């Protein structure tokens, strides 16, 4: 299995309101694109990635929130590791979020 490469997953705590599973919220809070949609895993921010204007990075630069998930591709990027994340917490929170996003699509 994956090594526990991202040390930021250990303290990940996902919101309980299932809010990101709502596709009506899949659009960038800064420029309103629906093309590239990265949901912050610390707060309810949603913002575009490098394909558009990388407002997701701008969010990290303004808040330090380190983890975001692309709601269609299911990639998780860690802005402190500067890499994509394949390891999960013991509760399997990232897998469940990914599986749930597959399901609501
Ligand atoms: Zn990390
Ligand atoms: Zn944007
Ligand atoms: Zn955030």
Q: What technique was this entry resolved by?
A: X-ray
Q: Indicate the SS3 state at residue 66.
A: coil
Decide the pairing of beta strands 67-70 and 76-78.
antiparallel
CA nearest to 86, candidates 100, 102, 72, 98: 98
93: domain CATH number is 3.30.40.10
Distance CA 75, CA 6 (A): 13
**Within-domain flag for 25:** yes
**Within-domain flag for 54:** yes
15 in Cβ contact with 24 (< 8 Å)? no
Tokens linked to 25: 């919220």
Among all chains, which residue has been given the structure tokens 């597959």?
102
**Within-domain flag for 9:** no
**Within-domain flag for 76:** yes
Expressed in angstroms and rounded, the spacing between residue 90 Cα and the centre of ligand 3 is 22
**What Cα–Cα distance (Å) separates residue 32 from each residue in 4, 28, 48, 49, 71?**
34, 4, 9, 12, 15
92 in Cβ contact with 59 (< 8 Å)? no
Radius of gyration, alpha carbons of the chain: 13
Distance CA 55, CA 18 (A): 22
Given its phi and psi angles, is residue 92 left (phi above 0), alpha (psi -120 to 50 degrees) or beta? left
Expressed in angstroms and rounded, the spacing between residue 68 Cα and the centre of ligand 2 is 14
Among all chains, which residue has been given the structure tokens 């979020």?
97
Can you give the resolution of this entry in Å? 1.4
**Within-domain flag for 4:** no
**Within-domain flag for 68:** yes
77 in Cβ contact with 85 (< 8 Å)? yes
Tokens linked to 102: 């597959």
Give the environment of ion ligand 3: residues with CB less than 5 A. Answer: 40, 42-43, 45, 65
Expressed in angstroms and rounded, the spacing between residue 67 Cα and the centre of ligand 3 is 8
Give the number of domains in the chain: 1
**Within-domain flag for 5:** no
**Within-domain flag for 87:** yes
Task: Give the range of the structural domain holding residue 85, as residue numbers without chain letter.
Answer: 17-104
Q: Indicate the SS3 state at residue 59.
A: helix
């Amino acid at each position: 299995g994956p090594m526990d490469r991202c040390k930021h997953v250990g303290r990940l705590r996902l919101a309980q309101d299932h809010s990101i599973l709502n596709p009506q919220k899949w659009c960038c809070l800064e420029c309103a694109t629906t093309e590239s949609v990265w949901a912050c895993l610390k707060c309810s921010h949603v913002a575009c990635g490098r394909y558009i204007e990388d407002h997701a990075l701008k969010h990290f630069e303004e808040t330090g929130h380190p983890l975001a998930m692309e709601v269609r591709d299911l990639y998780v990027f860690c802005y402190l590791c500067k890499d994509y994340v394949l390891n999960d917490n013991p509760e399997g929170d990232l897998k469940l979020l990914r599986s749930s996003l597959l399901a609501v699509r």
